[PDB]
Amino acid sequence: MIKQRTLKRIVQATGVGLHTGKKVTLTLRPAPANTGVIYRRTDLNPPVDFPADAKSVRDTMLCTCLVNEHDVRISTVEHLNAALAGLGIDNIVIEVNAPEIPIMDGSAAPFVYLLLDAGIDELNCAKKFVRIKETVRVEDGDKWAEFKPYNGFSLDFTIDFNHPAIDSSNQRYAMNFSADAFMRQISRARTFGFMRDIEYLQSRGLCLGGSFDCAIVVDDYRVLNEDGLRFEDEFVRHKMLDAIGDLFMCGHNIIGAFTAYKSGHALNNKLLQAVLAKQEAWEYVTFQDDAELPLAFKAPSA
Ligand SMILES: C[C@@H](O)[C@](C)(NC(=O)c1ccc(C#CC#Cc2ccc(N)cc2)cc1)C(=O)N=O
Ligand SMILES: [Zn+2]
């Protein structure tokens, strides 16, 4: 059978919150079958749990947040969420003693190492996949996102950037998903922002953890980070990272073809909810014999 996975052991890391600028301790814990991904704030007393759910998502000015029934929040979950998808973790408890997940270097890579430290435990319960059956499309003016039937998981992302530091040949990225491909091509791609906007946010006591160490920062003309970019098309690779984290909010790997033009957190989530709400458009599937498992969702080599 192709089994659900959780962590072998509890692991922990610290880092700075993007918003508060304060030290945040992150703890990742194993969890039983079918419980899914649960974000938990332990700064509040009692602790507050936020099950990863497409309906709970809110796209804030910076990054994304989950909310509960009373509009308490936990922010900056999507990069870590992308690593969960990348490594094929299905059940996990993620705790922070703060209102946000630490920003780290702005990519998913530090979470990759952290998850590898924790190990993998297979649970005796079938892993459920969401298989696309109808074509579903959502749009926001010029922008659109869609899913299409496909015996795999592919992503085709076009960003439209008329910034001098983003050349024409670097506005589109396409990949067939796999754990290895995510770790190698995507996980290290950093978030990015505009210096004047960051400056402004900080003059109002926001984005206090922002630094060159946690983001690519550009002014009107160029990248300001002294080491420059990790990839020539780092910007769009990061948007792909963000899309993987957005889609994994439903807690399941999706078998289908993802395509988006100028999409982002709001639209990708809008697609995720549109797909799920349209009952005929999708179905759960499991794999009794491993050999049925499409290559995209094979266990990571590492
Ligand atoms: C890319 C987007 O989709 C989005 C939301 N961008 C961000 O979340 C984001 C995160 C952080 C920053 C920043 C910063 C900074 C700084 C700074 C640098 C030097 C000094 N001296 C002071 C401050 C910007 C954006 C994103 O990553 N979404 O997943
Ligand atoms: Zn991001």
Size (the chain), residues: 302
Strands 64-67 and 73-75: antiparallel
- CA of residue 148 relative to chain centroid, distance: 20
Strands 3-7 and 120-126: antiparallel
Cβ atoms of residues 43 and 95 within 8 Å:
no
Give the active site residue among 19, 79, 238, 265. Answer: 265
Q: Closest Cα to atom 14, ligand 1: which residue?
A: 210
Cβ atoms of residues 19 and 99 within 8 Å:
yes
- Nearest CA to 91 out of 3, 179, 183 is that of 3
Ligand 1 pocket member 218 (CB < 6 A):
no
Ligand 2 ion local residues (Cβ < 5 A)? 191, 242
Which ligand ends up closest to the CA of 235?
A: 1
Ligand 1 pocket member 100 (CB < 6 A):
no
Domains of the chain by residue range: 1-128, 129-302
CA of residue 295 to ligand 1 center, whole Å:
34
Ligand 1 pocket member 189 (CB < 6 A):
no
Sheet holding 23-30, edge to edge: 11-16, 23-30, 92-96, 37-41, 48-51
CA of residue 175 to ligand 1 center, whole Å:
25
Task: Give the SS3 label for residue 36.
Answer: coil
The token pair at 29 is 């814990």
Sequence-ordered list of residues with C-beta below 8 angstroms from that of 184, at least 6 positions apart, any chain: none
What is each CA distance from 50 to 10, 36, 95, in whole angstroms?
Answer: 19, 11, 10
Cβ atoms of residues 240 and 263 within 8 Å:
no
Ligand 1 pocket member 210 (CB < 6 A):
yes
CB atoms within 10 A of CB 202: 14
CA of residue 62 to ligand 2 center, whole Å:
9
CB atoms within 10 A of CB 275: 25
Residue 293 amino acid letter: L
Query: In testing the pocket of ligand 1, which one of 75, 103, 187, 191 has its CB within 8 Å of the most ligand atoms?
Result: 191
In the chain, how long is the greatest CA-to-CA distance? Answer: 57
In degrees and rounded to multiples of 5, residue 146 shows phi and psi of -150, 155
Ligand 1 pocket member 212 (CB < 6 A):
yes
Task: Give the SS3 label for residue 178.
Answer: coil
Task: Give the SS3 label for residue 239.
Answer: helix
CA of residue 63 to ligand 2 center, whole Å:
6
In degrees and rounded to multiples of 5, residue 300 shows phi and psi of -60, 145
Known catalytic residue at 265: yes
Q: Closest Cα to atom 15, ligand 1: which residue?
A: 210
Task: Give the SS3 label for residue 17.
Answer: coil
CA of residue 197 to ligand 2 center, whole Å:
16
Cβ atoms of residues 95 and 70 within 8 Å:
no
Query: What is the rounded (10 degree) CA torsion for 55, 34, 276, 38?
Result: 20
Which ligand ends up closest to the CA of 107?
A: 2
Query: In testing the pocket of ligand 1, which one of 207, 235, 238 has its CB within 8 Å of the most ligand atoms?
Result: 207
Q: Closest Cα to atom 20, ligand 1: which residue?
A: 211
Strand partners, 75: 65, 100
Name the CATH topology of 129-302.
Answer: lpxc deacetylase, domain 1 (3.30.1700)
Record the resolution, in angstroms: 2.0
Query: Cα separation of 108 and 102, whole Å?
Result: 11
Task: Give the SS3 label for residue 285.
Answer: strand
- CATH class of the domain whose range is 1-128: alpha beta
